[PDB]
Amino acid sequence: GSGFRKELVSRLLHLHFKDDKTKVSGDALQLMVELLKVFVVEAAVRGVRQAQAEDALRVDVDQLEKVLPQLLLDF
Amino acid sequence: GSGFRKELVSRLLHLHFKDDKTKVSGDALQLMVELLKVFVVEAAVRGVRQAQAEDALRVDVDQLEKVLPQLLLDF
Amino acid sequence: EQQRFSYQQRLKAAVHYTVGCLCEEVALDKEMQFSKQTIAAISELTFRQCENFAKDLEMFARHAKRTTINTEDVKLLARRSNSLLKYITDKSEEIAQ
Amino acid sequence: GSMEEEAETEEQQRFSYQQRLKAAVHYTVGCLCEEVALDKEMQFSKQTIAAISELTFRQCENFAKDLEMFARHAKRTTINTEDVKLLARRSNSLLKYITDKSEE
């Protein structure tokens, strides 16, 4: 399946570090590539379950908003 | 004004520590007193803002329940 | 004489009392009253949140190879919001006085 | 070639870089959502995918700040797998998954 490129994740993390000396080990970077994936898939699948619980025909932003609060509390 | 007693906060914490050796410094304890007050004030203030948005007479538990996910995200 | 109320019962009642006084201050300041049931729910929330605070503080101390929790651990609890972090980083200094 | 003209050009460069980062996140989010949609036979709106992509971009901000703070807590300037395990500490589910992948 698909996934985030290491170099994109690195750039996303570095966009936000307060300190220029902060670095990320190679293993830690690979783990964050997997973590971001699981975050996205969790959001999508939870959105699917909500839309189904509402007898809806597609996942709309209105279903996604109901799942986001527990999603962010888990992550 | 009002505040939590340090002795009480010590007891609350010690109920949940996974390890029997875990101790808390005297300054850390005093700072936890302030943090717990901030948590309660934040809950109350968010509950008031939600009761105002819904044109209520008071903060009722249904209003409080709506702000809890976002409160918990901040703590 | 025998103790009448059990240990966590007495701790929840002491939390309830303080939460009540805090909510009384917010109600005067913000000009809006709280139901009794709201105040009880905030007190139960507060009691429950100490489990999460406690367990984080202990993992955070352990991350720094410590068994004694210090003010650095506590500051990490307030990290998500800059306003909370600055407010708790402040109060930390006032205690030092 | 005034200071205010230079500041404007630098802001434009920061802005377009952020936008390119957001685009690249949106791309991959679209790919993951397409795999979910086929697997679950449930369609996603274009607005839902955009919302997930903006959420993933924001979540990176909180992941990065936490990681840096956890490393520094341990007096390290290099973020390691133990800092990443601390991100997942509230969810036993997530922690086991991350701990699994770390044994590789």
Q: Are D62 and B73 in contact (CB under 8 A)?
A: no
Nearest CA in chain A to D84: A28
Q: End-to-end alpha-carbon separation of chain B, Å?
A: 23
D43: phi > 0 → left, psi -120 to 50 → alpha, else beta; which?
beta
User: What's the distance, CA A49 to chain centroid?
Assistant: 17
Measured CA to CA in angstroms, residue A38 lies from A2, A45, C44, D52 at distances of 12, 10, 33, 13
Domain A1-33 matches domain A34-75 at the CATH topology level = no
Beta bridge partners of C34: B59
User: What's the distance, CA A46 to chain centroid?
Assistant: 12
Considering only CA atoms, which of B70, D87, D45, D82 is closest in space to residue A38? D87
> Which residue matches tokens 């190679």?
A26
DSSP B54: T
> Which residue matches tokens 């006085």?
C97
Residues in Cβ contact with A59 at an 8 Å cutoff, skipping those fewer than 6 apart: A44, A47, A48, A50, A51, D42, D43, D44, D45, D48
Q: B24 phi and psi, to 5 degrees?
A: -125, 130
Tokens standing for B65? 């329940």
> Which residue matches tokens 């990320």?
A24
Residue A35 is which amino acid?
L
Q: Are D95 and D88 in contact (CB under 8 A)?
A: yes
d(Cα C32, Cα B53) in Å, to the nearest integer?
13
Q: Where are the beta strands (DSSP E) in B1-75?
A: 23-24
The answer to whether B25 contacts chain C (CB < 8 Å) is: yes
Q: What is the maximum span of chain C, computed from C-alpha positions, in angstroms?
A: 51
Query: Looking at the domain that runs over C1-97, which CATH code has it been given?
Result: 1.10.20.10
Beta bridge partners of B23: C68
B2: phi > 0 → left, psi -120 to 50 → alpha, else beta; which?
beta
Touch criterion met for B and A (3+ Cβ pairs within 8 Å): yes
The CATH class of the A1-33 domain is mainly alpha
> Which residue matches tokens 């004030």?
B41
Q: What angle do CA A71, A73, A75 make, to 5 degrees?
A: 70
Tokens standing for C75? 């500051």
Contact D74 C65 (CB under 8 A): yes
A34-75 has CATH 1.10.3720.10 classification: no
Cited resolution, angstroms = 2.1
Residues in Cβ contact with D10 at an 8 Å cutoff, skipping those fewer than 6 apart: none
- The domain D1-104 is placed in CATH, from the list 3.40.440.10, 2.120.10.30, 1.10.150.240, 1.10.20.10, at 1.10.20.10
Experiment type: X-ray
Domain ranges of chain B: 1-33, 34-75
DSSP C80: T
Find chain B residues with C-beta within 8 A of A72's C-beta.
73
Mutate to test the interface with D, among A18, A35, A55, A58 (most CBs of D within 10 A): A35
d(Cα C64, Cα C75) in Å, to the nearest integer?
14
Q: Are A9 and A33 in contact (CB under 8 A)?
A: yes
- Touching subunits of B (3+ CB pairs, under 8 Å) are A, C
Beta bridge partners of D44: A59
Residues in Cβ contact with A69 at an 8 Å cutoff, skipping those fewer than 6 apart: B69, B70, B73
User: What's the distance, CA D25 to chain centroid?
Assistant: 8
Considering only CA atoms, which of D83, B28, D72 is closest in space to residue C68? B28
Q: Are D78 and A23 in contact (CB under 8 A)?
A: yes
Domain ranges of chain C: 1-97
Q: C65 phi and psi, to 5 degrees?
A: 60, 35
Q: In Å, how far is D103's CA from the nearest CA of chain A?
A: 10
d(Cα D89, Cα A50) in Å, to the nearest integer?
26
Touch criterion met for A and C (3+ Cβ pairs within 8 Å): no
d(Cα B70, Cα B14) in Å, to the nearest integer?
27
Residue D102 is which amino acid?
S
